[PDB]
Amino acid sequence: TMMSGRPGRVPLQFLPNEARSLPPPKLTDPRLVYMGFLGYCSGLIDNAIRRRPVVSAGLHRQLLYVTSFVFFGYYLLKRQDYMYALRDHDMFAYVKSHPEDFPEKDKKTYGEILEEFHPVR
Amino acid sequence: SWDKDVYPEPPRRTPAPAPQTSLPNPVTYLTKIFDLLVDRPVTLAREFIEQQHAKNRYYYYHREFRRVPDITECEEKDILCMFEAEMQWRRDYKVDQEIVNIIQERLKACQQREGESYRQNCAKELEQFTQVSKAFQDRYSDLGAHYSARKCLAKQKQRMLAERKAAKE
């Protein structure tokens, strides 16, 4: 289950305090813009289902859709970035603490390596 | 305009006109008519256009790429060095293709110019084309549609191993 059993993980915590050391996702993030686009599409489908003008009826409702989607998308992206940073940090620490399992290989240039040539006739 | 060393042309040996009959050669009169009705206006137009070109004289340059370390001096996964070497190798491949093209142009020019004595008078051009073709076929052949510098290196290594085996026998 990988990250579930990490030491110090507080249960039912969306964003740990250590996540604040990471840069927050920019408000112009393409992922956040796509979340807003999903909210707008949800508003359009809500208008379509209730048989009202799709692109004009209920501007407040569509605005609320977009705002909620952007808000939850921002927090979701922050958590995702935190989790990927945790993964990279743990991988780097494990590599550093286990030199034998990840040894540097001899760097032989192509002039030295013999790769067989397969002709195309 | 073109360097005559790159494209050799033999000295022009044109026989002198020595007519024996007194009939008026229609070819001479036709050539004079052509030179009066076509050459003169064409030359005047070219003079005008060349004057206009000389009025606004600007230049263009031949981009020169410096030599880059080859695929031989390139680490296993050094993507940057491999990219540089691959681009240089592709440029060299294009240059060698154009060299073969120049040699083929020489061969065709010799074949046409010599007329009915091309077989004996173009042996040198045939020899040059044979040398260049053998070199090109040794270097760039059987690589396939997905050729790369690593593949030429492999073919060269195979050829050198074969040469060593022949030398040790």
DSSP track, B59-105: ------PPP---STT--SS-HHHHHHHHHHHHHHHHHHHHHHHHHHH
Q: What single DSSP character describes residue B25? A: -
CB nearest to B144's CB, from A107, A111, A120: A120
**Which residues of chain A make contact with B71, given a CB cutoff of 8 A?**
110-111
Give the separation between CA A107 and CA B76, rounded to whole angstroms. 7
The beta-carbon contacts of B141-148 under 8 Å, at least 24 apart in sequence, are: B142/A119, B142/A120, B142/A121, B143/A119, B143/A120, B144/A119, B144/A120, B145/A120, B148/B86, B148/B89
Q: At how many degrees (to 10) do helices A59-97 and A30-49 cross?
A: 140
Cα B12 from Cα B17, distance rounded (Å): 15
Number of CB pairs, chain A paired with chain B, less than 8 A apart = 42
The distance from CA A72 to its chain's CA centroid, rounded to whole angstroms, is 14
List the resolution, Å: 2.9
Distance CA B163, CA B169 (A): 10
* A121 interfaces chain B, CB cutoff of 8 Å: yes
Between CA B108 and CA A73 the distance in angstroms is: 70
* Closest Cα in chain A to B158: A117
- Domain extent listing, chain A: 1-98
Is residue A46 within 8 Å of A61, Cβ to Cβ?
A: yes
CB atoms closer than 10 angstroms to residue A116: 7
- Structural biology method used: cryo-EM
Q: Which residues contact B105 (CB under 8 A, 6 or more apart)?
A: B7
* B144 contacts on A by Cβ (under 8 Å): 119-120
Q: Say yes or no for a CB contact (<8 Å) between A116 and B72.
A: no
Helices (H), chain B: 26-34, 40-55, 79-113, 118-121, 123-139, 149-167
* Tokens 């991988």 belong to residue: A91
